[PDB]
Amino acid sequence: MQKYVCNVCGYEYDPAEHDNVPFDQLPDDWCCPVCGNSKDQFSPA
Ligand code: NI
């Protein structure tokens, strides 16, 4: 259940915090809910 970290603000997308919804199921236009950084500028962590 891969966690991802925003390269801009350090927000961590942890699927565990979201009913195990994986990063790869998020919308095409999903952005960081803290800083609005785009999905494709997150690192696996
Ligand atoms: Ni961010």
Q: Where are the domains of the chain?
A: 1-45
Residues 6 or more apart whose Cβ sits within 8 Å of residue 37:
6, 7, 8, 9, 31
Cited resolution, angstroms: 1.9
CA quadruple 17, 18, 24, 26: dihedral sign: negative
Quote the ligand 1 centre to 39 CA distance (angstroms): 9
Quote the ligand 1 centre to 6 CA distance (angstroms): 5
Q: Are 23 and 13 within 8 A, CB to CB? A: yes
Quote the ligand 1 centre to 2 CA distance (angstroms): 17
**CA end-to-end span of the chain:** 11
- CATH number given to 1-45: 2.20.28.10
This entry's atomic model was obtained through X-ray
